[PDB]
Amino acid sequence: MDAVVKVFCVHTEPNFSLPWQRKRQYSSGSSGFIIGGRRVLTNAHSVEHHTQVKLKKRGSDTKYLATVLAIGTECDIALLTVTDDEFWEGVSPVEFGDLPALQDAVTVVGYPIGGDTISVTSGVVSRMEILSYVHGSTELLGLQIDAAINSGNSGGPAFNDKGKCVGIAFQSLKHEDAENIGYVIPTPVIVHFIQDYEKH
Amino acid sequence: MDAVVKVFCVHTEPNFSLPWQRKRQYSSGSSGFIIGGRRVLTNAHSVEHHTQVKLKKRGSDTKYLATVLAIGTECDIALLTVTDDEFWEGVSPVEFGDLPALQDAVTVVGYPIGGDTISVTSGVVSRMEILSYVHGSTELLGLQIDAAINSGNSGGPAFNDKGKCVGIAFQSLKHEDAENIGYVIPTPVIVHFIQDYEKH
Amino acid sequence: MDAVVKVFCVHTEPNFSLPWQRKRQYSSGSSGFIIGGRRVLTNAHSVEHHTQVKLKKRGSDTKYLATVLAIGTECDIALLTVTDDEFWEGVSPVEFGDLPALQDAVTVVGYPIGGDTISVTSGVVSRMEILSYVHGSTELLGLQIDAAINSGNSGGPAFNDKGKCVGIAFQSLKHEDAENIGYVIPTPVIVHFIQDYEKH
Amino acid sequence: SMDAVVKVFCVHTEPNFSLPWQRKRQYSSGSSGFIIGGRRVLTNAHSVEHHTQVKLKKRGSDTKYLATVLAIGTECDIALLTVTDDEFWEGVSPVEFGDLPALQDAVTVVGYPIGGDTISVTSGVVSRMEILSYVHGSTELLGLQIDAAINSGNSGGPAFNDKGKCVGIAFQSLKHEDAENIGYVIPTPVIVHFIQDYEK
Amino acid sequence: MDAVVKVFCVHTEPNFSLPWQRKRQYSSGSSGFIIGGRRVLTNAHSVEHHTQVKLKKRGSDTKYLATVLAIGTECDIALLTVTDDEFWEGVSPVEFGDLPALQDAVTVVGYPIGGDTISVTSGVVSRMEILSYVHGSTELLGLQIDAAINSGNSGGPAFNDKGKCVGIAFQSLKHEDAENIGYVIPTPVIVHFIQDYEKH
Amino acid sequence: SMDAVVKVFCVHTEPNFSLPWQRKRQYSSGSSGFIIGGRRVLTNAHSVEHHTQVKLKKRGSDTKYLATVLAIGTECDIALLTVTDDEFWEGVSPVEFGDLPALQDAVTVVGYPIGGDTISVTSGVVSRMEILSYVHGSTELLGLQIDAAINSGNSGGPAFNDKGKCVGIAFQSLKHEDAENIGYVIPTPVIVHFIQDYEK
Amino acid sequence: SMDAVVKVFCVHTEPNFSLPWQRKRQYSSGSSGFIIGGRRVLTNAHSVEHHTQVKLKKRGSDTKYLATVLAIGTECDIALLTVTDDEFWEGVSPVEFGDLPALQDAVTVVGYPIGGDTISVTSGVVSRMEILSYVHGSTELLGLQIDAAINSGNSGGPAFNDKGKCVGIAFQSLKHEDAENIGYVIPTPVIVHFIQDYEK
Amino acid sequence: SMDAVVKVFCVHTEPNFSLPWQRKRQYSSGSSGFIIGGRRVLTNAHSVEHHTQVKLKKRGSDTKYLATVLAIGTECDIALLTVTDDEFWEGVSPVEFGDLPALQDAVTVVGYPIGGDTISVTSGVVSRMEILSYVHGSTELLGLQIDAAINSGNSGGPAFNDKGKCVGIAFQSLKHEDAENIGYVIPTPVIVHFIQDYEK
C-alpha cells in the first residue's frame, strides 16, 4: 500500500475534436506500484508518446523523474524505474500471492484522477479469460471484476484477501463504462512481460 | 432512529431555466440527525442561502425553528441547533461506532422527499477514499456504498451492524444517479468539522 | 404455490396515442393468490374500470369468473372472489409469515405476461419504508427488493425463506424500470386493507 | 386572434401508483383552449378528465372562471366547454376556422406553456396528413402532423394558417418526446364531427 | 471443460441494412460442448440456413466438419456430430448434475467471439420459469442468471458447483443487453429435445 | 394516385428467440405496396418473406384479397406481387413513374401506418443520393435518402415527385431509428433491374 | 458588427459538491458579451455571478481587461458591465439595436466558443415567441426561441437580424441539451427594462 | 466533378486496448479524398496516420493504387498525397476551388460511405462559421459547419458550392454522433496554409 505511486504524464488526445484545430492535449493522471528490483509497474496507455513521466509517493509532495524501461504492445503494461535513490528509500515492494478464483474478493488501490488521495475499491472476480497452448497446458490470461475502476486508478495494483498482489488494474474502456465492470491483468501475464524484457 | 429528523428549507435553483424568467425556487426536503450537546447534523447544500430552516421529529407533526450554527465548504455538512427545549425532550442522540471496512453492511436512515415516513436503506461499503498526511498517518476521508440514496435522505445518519453511527449520508449527484451508488462522510471528517467550529 | 393464480382483464390505455384516435385498449395479464376465506388477492391497477375479470389456476386451462369485492385507492390492492366452488376445490391458501428484515431473501411467484407458465424470481429486501403514528408505534409500510418484477407478475405473492407469504409484489413503474428494482406491499398494509373492507 | 386563447386549469391525478402503498399522486395541471362561436370553448379531453372541476384564465387578467364541461370526446382528444359568467365572454372575438391545410403549409400554434401565465406562439409546417377513406371512395382529413414540438401546456390551444384562421386544435406527442420536433393537430372535419355528435 | 468446443458458421443478417443492397453476411462465432454418444450440443440460432459448420477443440488449431443432426424450433438447441474420429479421441463428455436452485452459483464456459481463448463466467440463478402439465406435475423450463453471457459464449455449457453440467447458455437478446442478465436452458428441456429427435 | 396504394398483411415471425426455451415469437404484421402496370403490385421483400401467404387491402373497403408472390428480391428489398381476383384490379389506375429526382427535390410518400387502415401522406426532400459507377464511366442511381422519417407500416408504399408521378419505393431506416428524420427510397432504375431480371 | 463582440472570463465555482467530502469544484469559465452605447457591455448574469472579478478580451488581441460589474439581473439572465481602461473602448463601434423580430425571421448569433479565442457565427430562425400581456390588453415580447443550438461559450453574445442590427442577447438551453437545435434569445424590451431599472 | 473523388484505404489500428491483455485491435478502414492540381490528392490526416501504406481507388474500377504520403497535418486534419502510377492521373480533371461560402449557402459533399465502393452525394447548408482574427483586425475563415450528417467514409471528400467548385474538405463530427445532423468542412484558406507550409 505504501508501494502504490501516482503517475503524472501528458496525454495527447487521439482525435481532432475539430478538423481545423490542433489535437487537444493536457496533463493526465494514472497509477502504478513498486515491485522488487527498483522497478515500478503501470499501464502502457499512459506513457505512450511520452516526453517525461513523473512519479509521486503517498505522503510526500515531491515528484520524481521516472525512466521508461519498456512499453508493452501485447498487453497494457509499462515498466518504469527512477534514478534517484531517495525514491526507493523506506518503501516495501508488493508481494505476489496466489491466483484468485471466481467470486474471489479483490481490492484495487489507486489514485483517482485530479487528486492526491488514495482510493480503495472492492470488487469480485466475475469472469476469467484462459489461454490454452498446444502442449495441453492452460495459463490465466484475463480477469474481470464486478466493480468499476475509476479513471486515475488504472495501472495500480490489485490485491487478494491476504494483501498480496494478484495483478495490474484497468478501467473498462470498450463497451459501456462505469457500469460496475473492471479488468485486471493476472500475474502470469506480468511475468511473461518482464521475461520478454529481461531476456531481450 | 428516534434521533433522525426531517429538514425543511427553501431551495433556489442554480440556473435560469429560461433566460427571461426569474430563477425557479420551491420548498425542498432533506434529512438530519441529533447528536450530543443539543446539536443536529445535516448537509450544507440544503441550508445554503437559507432564510429559515425548520425541523420535525418522527411521530410529531410539530415543526421547530432550527438555528444554523455553521455551514461547511470543505465538506457538505451543516451544524444546527434549536432554541425550543421541547425539541430535545425525550430524544437520545446517536452513538458513533467503529469505522466500517470494505464490504461492511451499512444502513442509511432518512426521510424521502415529499413525505413524512422514514426510509431505511441497505448498502455495502464498496469504496473508500483515504487521506495521507506528510507525518505518515492516514485518516479515512470518504465512503462509497453500493446503494442509491434517494433525494430527501441526504444528510441522514449511516449506521453499522450494531446500530452505531458511522457518518452522514449523501445522494450521488455527479456522474450518473440512481445507479446504486451512494456516498457517506466518515466520522473523522465530522469530527474535524466540529473541531474547526468549536475552536474558532 | 398452488395458490398462485393468473389474472385476465382488459386494460384501456391512459393516453390517446394519437389525438384523432380512440384510446387504445387490449387484453392484459396480471397475477394474484388465494388467501383464506374464499378470497383472492391481486393488484388494483389491473381491475380498474373492469367489465369482467377472469382467473386461472396452474395446471388447468379452465378460466373462472372472478367477482371484484373491493379496489384499493390508498394502496394497489384488489380483493376478489369466485362464485364457482370448483375453483376452491383442492387448493391451499397461502400462509402469512414473519415480516422480513433488510437483506432478507424473498421470492416472488407470478405468471409473466403472455404465457401460462409460472415465473419464480429471487430478490433481497434492499429498502423499507416505515410508518410512524403519533402514539409512538411504528408499522411497516413498504418493501423494496433488488430484483425486477416483470410485467405479468405484479400482484402475485412474495415469500420468505420458509415458504410463508410476506406480501403482494409489484413491478416498479415510476423512475426507470427493469433496473433490478421491485416493490412489495408488507402484510400489515394488506391487513388494514381487509380490515377497512370487512368493517365497512 | 390572441384574445380567444385561454389557459385551462384542472386537478390531474396520475394513472399509475407512484409506489404501491401510496395514493396515486395528484397535482394541479395546466393546458390550453380557445373560444369559439356560440358561447363555447374547445380544449383537449385528457386535461378535463375525471370529474374534477375546471377553471379558465384569459390573456390579460389572473381572474379564473369556473367552466362547465359540456362534452368529453372518446373517439378523439377534444372537450367542449362553457362558462356561466357573462364577463368571461365580454369583449372577445371567437376564433374563425379556415381552409383545410395542405402539406408544407405554414401554421402557427398559440398556447400557454405549463407553469406560467404568458402566451406562447410556435411556428410549424404540416409534415404529414392522415386521411380517412369511405366505402365509395370519398376522403376526409383525419390528422395533421407538424414539424414543431408542442410544449405540454399548449395542448388544446388553436392552430392557425397564414391567414390567421383556425385550422385545428394543437397537441403534443406523448410518445415520442420531446425534441423529436413532432407535433399533432386535429383538423376541422374531426372537430365538426365532434360538435355535430354533441348537438345531435 | 475439455469438452467445450468453438463453433464456426456463416451468419446472414436478418435485415436489409439499406433497401438497395444485398443482405449483409459474415462469418460468426458460437460455442458448444461434447455430450455422450459422439454428439455435440450448441444453439440453433447459429446453424440456421447453414451451408457448413466447423468445430474446433481447445488446444488444437485444427478445424473439423460438423454434421447438423437436428435444429430445434421450440427451443434454441442444435444437435451436431462429426464423422472424423480424431475429433472424439481423448475427450470426455460433460456430466449432467442436479438441477440448480435459486441463488445457486453457476459457471458458463464458452469462447468469446473473435478469439480462440476460453472465457469462464460466474453467475447466480436469479429466476426460474416453470412448466405445469394438466397431470399435476411440474418440470423446470427456464433459468435466468445475474451475469451477462457475451456473444460468442452462447451455446456453451453451464456448470454447477460440482463441475457438472446443468444446461446450455444463452446471451440475452430481447429487452436490453449486457445489463448482467443471461439465460440457461435446463437439462429437462435438453432431454425432451433429444428424445423428440431419437424417437422420430 | 391514392387508389393505387394498398395495405399488405403478412404473418411475421421474428428472427430471434425471445427466450431460448420458447418458439420464436410470431405475429401479424402490416406494410404497404402499390399497383403498377400489367396486373402487378410492388412492395418490400422483407414483409413477404417466409412462405406465409400475403393478403392485400384497398383504400375504401376492408375486403382482403389473397396475393400471389411472383418474385422476392435478394439484391434489394423489393417484392413483386399479383392477385387472382379480378375485382381487385377493377377501377384502379396504376401508378405512373416519372423523372429521376435530384438533390433537394420535394417528394411525397404514401402508405398505411401499422395497426390502422387509414392512409398516411408524408412530406420529404431528397437529402442524399447513392450512385453506382461502371467500368467505363457511366452512372446509375442506386439509392435515395429523404429528410423525413417513414413510419413502419409505410415501407413498400410509393414515393411521388411534385408532378404526382412515382419515383421509387419508400422504406424506413431499421437502424438508426426513429426520429432521426432519415428515410430511404429505392429509385426506379433498381426497380427496373428487378423487373427485367424477373421477366428474363 | 464583429468588433463589438467580446469574450468574458470569470472563475466559475460549481453549485454542487462533486463529492461530499471535497470543496465544490471550481474552474475558469468562458462566455460572451458585447459593447453597447454609453461605455457599457452586456453579457449574461450567470457567468459573472459570485463576487469573482471578470476579465474581457477583444477580437484581435489576447489582452485581457478588468471589468466592473454594474448590475446583475435576477428577473432575467442579463448583466451590465463596464471597463475602466480607455483603450478598451478605443476604435470600437457599439452594437445598434433594430426592429422586434417576427416568427421565421433569420437571425445571426455571434460569440466565442468555450476554450478558444476565435469568433463563431451561428445561423438561426425565430421558431417561437413568448409574449407578456397586461391588465388592459397590451402585449410585449418576453422571449425568443431559435432553431439553432447555441454552444456554451456563446451565451451573452449578440443576436442580429438580416440588417445587422442587434435584436437581443443569445443563450443556450441548459436543459434540454444539446443537439435538440433549440436556442434562446432575450429580446430588446427585456434588455430595456433591465437598463431602465438600473438607471432608476 | 465526380471523377476526381477517390476512395482511401488504410489499415487503422485503434487508440485503445479493447482488453488490457490483448493487442490493440486493428482493422482495415475506409475514407475519401480528391485529386487536385499538380499531381496531388487531398484527404484527412487521421486516416493515413501511423506508417501504414495507403491505397487509392477510383470511381469506375476496383483497381487500387499505392499512394505516397507527402505531408500529414497536425494543426489541421489534412493530408497531402500523390501516386506514382501515371495511369492513376490519366483522364481525370482535378477539382477547381471556388469563392468562400457564406452562411446559408447550399453545399454538396461527395464521398464513399465505408464498406462500399459506390459514391455518395450529400446535401447540406453552411450553418456556422468559425472566424480567426489578426492583431490588426483582419479576418480569415477557419471552419465551416453544415446542417447535414457526414457519414464515416465520407471524411476527406470534397465539398462543393452551387457552381460545382470545391470549397473545402468534408469531415464528420466524432463527438457528437451521429444523427445530430452536424457536419464539418475545412475551408480553403486553411487548405492553402497547409500547402504553402508544405512547399515552403
Short mmCIF file of all heavy atoms in Angstrom, two decimals, chain F residues 168-194, unseen atoms left out:
data_model
loop_
_atom_site.label_atom_id
_atom_site.label_comp_id
_atom_site.label_asym_id
_atom_site.label_seq_id
_atom_site.Cartn_x
_atom_site.Cartn_y
_atom_site.Cartn_z
N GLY F 168 -40.08 5.93 -56.85
CA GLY F 168 -39.40 4.87 -56.13
C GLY F 168 -40.29 4.22 -55.10
O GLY F 168 -41.47 4.56 -55.00
N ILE F 169 -39.74 3.28 -54.34
CA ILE F 169 -40.46 2.64 -53.24
C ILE F 169 -39.91 3.15 -51.91
O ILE F 169 -38.70 3.28 -51.74
CB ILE F 169 -40.29 1.11 -53.28
CG1 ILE F 169 -40.50 0.58 -54.68
CG2 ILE F 169 -41.25 0.44 -52.33
CD1 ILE F 169 -40.29 -0.91 -54.77
N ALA F 170 -40.80 3.43 -50.96
CA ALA F 170 -40.38 4.03 -49.69
C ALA F 170 -40.04 2.98 -48.64
O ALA F 170 -40.67 1.93 -48.57
CB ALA F 170 -41.44 4.98 -49.18
N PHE F 171 -39.02 3.28 -47.82
CA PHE F 171 -38.55 2.38 -46.77
C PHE F 171 -38.16 3.15 -45.52
O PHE F 171 -37.68 4.28 -45.60
CB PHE F 171 -37.32 1.61 -47.25
CG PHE F 171 -37.62 0.62 -48.31
CD1 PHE F 171 -37.74 1.01 -49.63
CD2 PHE F 171 -37.81 -0.72 -47.98
CE1 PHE F 171 -38.03 0.09 -50.61
CE2 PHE F 171 -38.09 -1.65 -48.96
CZ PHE F 171 -38.20 -1.24 -50.28
N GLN F 172 -38.33 2.53 -44.35
CA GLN F 172 -37.84 3.13 -43.11
C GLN F 172 -36.46 2.60 -42.76
O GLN F 172 -36.12 1.46 -43.09
CB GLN F 172 -38.81 2.88 -41.95
CG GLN F 172 -38.75 1.49 -41.35
CD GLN F 172 -39.34 1.44 -39.95
OE1 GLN F 172 -39.37 2.44 -39.23
NE2 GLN F 172 -39.83 0.27 -39.56
N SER F 173 -35.66 3.44 -42.09
CA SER F 173 -34.34 3.02 -41.63
C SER F 173 -34.50 2.11 -40.43
O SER F 173 -35.09 2.50 -39.43
CB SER F 173 -33.51 4.23 -41.22
OG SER F 173 -34.01 5.41 -41.82
N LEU F 174 -33.96 0.90 -40.54
CA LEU F 174 -34.12 -0.07 -39.47
C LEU F 174 -33.14 0.18 -38.31
O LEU F 174 -33.41 -0.19 -37.16
CB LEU F 174 -34.01 -1.49 -40.03
CG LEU F 174 -35.10 -1.77 -41.07
CD1 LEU F 174 -34.90 -3.12 -41.75
CD2 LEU F 174 -36.49 -1.66 -40.45
N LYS F 175 -32.02 0.83 -38.62
CA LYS F 175 -31.07 1.32 -37.62
C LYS F 175 -30.17 2.31 -38.34
O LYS F 175 -29.37 1.89 -39.18
CB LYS F 175 -30.25 0.17 -37.05
N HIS F 176 -30.25 3.61 -38.04
CA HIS F 176 -30.97 4.23 -36.91
C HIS F 176 -32.50 4.21 -36.90
O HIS F 176 -33.14 3.75 -37.84
CB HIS F 176 -30.52 5.70 -36.78
CG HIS F 176 -30.02 6.29 -38.07
ND1 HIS F 176 -30.66 6.11 -39.28
CD2 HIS F 176 -28.93 7.05 -38.33
CE1 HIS F 176 -29.99 6.73 -40.23
NE2 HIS F 176 -28.94 7.32 -39.68
N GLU F 177 -33.06 4.74 -35.81
CA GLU F 177 -34.50 4.72 -35.54
C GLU F 177 -34.79 5.52 -34.26
O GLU F 177 -34.12 5.32 -33.25
CB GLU F 177 -34.97 3.26 -35.37
CG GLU F 177 -36.43 3.09 -34.99
CD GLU F 177 -36.92 1.66 -35.15
OE1 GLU F 177 -36.25 0.89 -35.87
OE2 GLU F 177 -37.96 1.32 -34.55
N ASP F 178 -35.78 6.41 -34.30
CA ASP F 178 -36.63 6.65 -35.47
C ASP F 178 -36.62 8.12 -35.86
O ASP F 178 -36.42 8.47 -37.02
CB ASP F 178 -38.07 6.20 -35.18
N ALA F 179 -36.83 8.99 -34.87
CA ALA F 179 -36.92 10.42 -35.12
C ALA F 179 -35.54 11.03 -35.39
O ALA F 179 -35.20 12.09 -34.87
CB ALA F 179 -37.58 11.12 -33.94
N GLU F 180 -34.75 10.34 -36.22
CA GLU F 180 -33.51 10.91 -36.73
C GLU F 180 -33.90 11.61 -38.03
O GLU F 180 -33.08 12.28 -38.66
CB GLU F 180 -32.48 9.83 -36.99
N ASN F 181 -35.17 11.43 -38.41
CA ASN F 181 -35.75 12.03 -39.61
C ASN F 181 -35.07 11.55 -40.89
O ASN F 181 -34.96 12.30 -41.86
CB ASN F 181 -35.74 13.56 -39.51
N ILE F 182 -34.63 10.30 -40.90
CA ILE F 182 -33.99 9.74 -42.08
C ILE F 182 -34.91 8.71 -42.71
O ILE F 182 -35.50 7.89 -42.01
CB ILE F 182 -32.64 9.12 -41.74
N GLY F 183 -35.03 8.76 -44.04
CA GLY F 183 -35.86 7.81 -44.77
C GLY F 183 -35.20 7.39 -46.08
O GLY F 183 -34.49 8.18 -46.70
N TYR F 184 -35.46 6.16 -46.50
CA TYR F 184 -34.86 5.64 -47.72
C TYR F 184 -35.88 5.41 -48.83
O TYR F 184 -37.04 5.09 -48.58
CB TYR F 184 -34.09 4.35 -47.43
CG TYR F 184 -32.94 4.56 -46.46
CD1 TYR F 184 -32.78 3.75 -45.35
CD2 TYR F 184 -32.03 5.59 -46.66
CE1 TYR F 184 -31.74 3.94 -44.47
CE2 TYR F 184 -30.99 5.79 -45.78
CZ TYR F 184 -30.85 4.97 -44.69
OH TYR F 184 -29.80 5.17 -43.82
N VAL F 185 -35.43 5.59 -50.07
CA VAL F 185 -36.24 5.31 -51.25
C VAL F 185 -35.38 4.57 -52.26
O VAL F 185 -34.26 4.96 -52.55
CB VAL F 185 -36.76 6.62 -51.89
CG1 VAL F 185 -37.52 6.31 -53.17
CG2 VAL F 185 -37.63 7.40 -50.92
N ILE F 186 -35.91 3.47 -52.80
CA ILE F 186 -35.22 2.78 -53.88
C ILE F 186 -35.68 3.39 -55.17
O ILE F 186 -36.86 3.35 -55.48
CB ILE F 186 -35.56 1.30 -53.91
CG1 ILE F 186 -35.21 0.63 -52.59
CG2 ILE F 186 -34.83 0.63 -55.05
CD1 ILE F 186 -35.45 -0.84 -52.59
N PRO F 187 -34.75 3.96 -55.95
CA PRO F 187 -35.15 4.69 -57.16
C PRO F 187 -35.53 3.75 -58.29
O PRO F 187 -35.29 2.54 -58.21
CB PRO F 187 -33.91 5.50 -57.51
CG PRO F 187 -32.75 4.83 -56.79
CD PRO F 187 -33.30 3.75 -55.89
N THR F 188 -36.12 4.29 -59.34
CA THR F 188 -36.67 3.48 -60.42
C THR F 188 -35.68 2.57 -61.18
O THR F 188 -36.06 1.45 -61.53
CB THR F 188 -37.49 4.34 -61.40
OG1 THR F 188 -36.66 5.36 -61.95
CG2 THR F 188 -38.65 4.99 -60.68
N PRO F 189 -34.44 3.02 -61.44
CA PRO F 189 -33.50 2.12 -62.12
C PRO F 189 -33.37 0.77 -61.45
O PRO F 189 -33.28 -0.24 -62.14
CB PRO F 189 -32.17 2.86 -62.02
CG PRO F 189 -32.54 4.28 -62.02
CD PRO F 189 -33.85 4.36 -61.27
N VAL F 190 -33.38 0.75 -60.12
CA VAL F 190 -33.24 -0.51 -59.39
C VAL F 190 -34.51 -1.34 -59.55
O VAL F 190 -34.44 -2.56 -59.73
CB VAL F 190 -32.96 -0.25 -57.91
CG1 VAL F 190 -32.88 -1.56 -57.13
CG2 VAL F 190 -31.69 0.55 -57.75
N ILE F 191 -35.66 -0.68 -59.48
CA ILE F 191 -36.93 -1.34 -59.69
C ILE F 191 -36.96 -1.96 -61.08
O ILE F 191 -37.38 -3.11 -61.25
CB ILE F 191 -38.11 -0.36 -59.53
CG1 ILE F 191 -38.10 0.26 -58.13
CG2 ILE F 191 -39.43 -1.06 -59.80
CD1 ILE F 191 -39.20 1.26 -57.90
N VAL F 192 -36.50 -1.20 -62.06
CA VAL F 192 -36.43 -1.67 -63.44
C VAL F 192 -35.52 -2.89 -63.59
O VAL F 192 -35.88 -3.85 -64.27
CB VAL F 192 -36.00 -0.54 -64.39
CG1 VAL F 192 -35.75 -1.08 -65.78
CG2 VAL F 192 -37.06 0.54 -64.44
N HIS F 193 -34.36 -2.87 -62.95
CA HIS F 193 -33.49 -4.04 -62.98
C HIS F 193 -34.16 -5.24 -62.33
O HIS F 193 -34.01 -6.37 -62.79
CB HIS F 193 -32.15 -3.75 -62.29
CG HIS F 193 -31.28 -2.79 -63.05
ND1 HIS F 193 -31.58 -2.35 -64.32
CD2 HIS F 193 -30.11 -2.19 -62.71
CE1 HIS F 193 -30.64 -1.51 -64.73
NE2 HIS F 193 -29.74 -1.40 -63.77
N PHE F 194 -34.90 -5.00 -61.26
CA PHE F 194 -35.57 -6.08 -60.55
C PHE F 194 -36.60 -6.76 -61.45
O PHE F 194 -36.74 -7.99 -61.45
CB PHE F 194 -36.25 -5.53 -59.30
CG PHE F 194 -37.14 -6.52 -58.60
CD1 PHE F 194 -36.59 -7.52 -57.82
CD2 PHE F 194 -38.51 -6.44 -58.73
CE1 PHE F 194 -37.41 -8.43 -57.17
CE2 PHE F 194 -39.33 -7.35 -58.09
CZ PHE F 194 -38.78 -8.35 -57.31
#
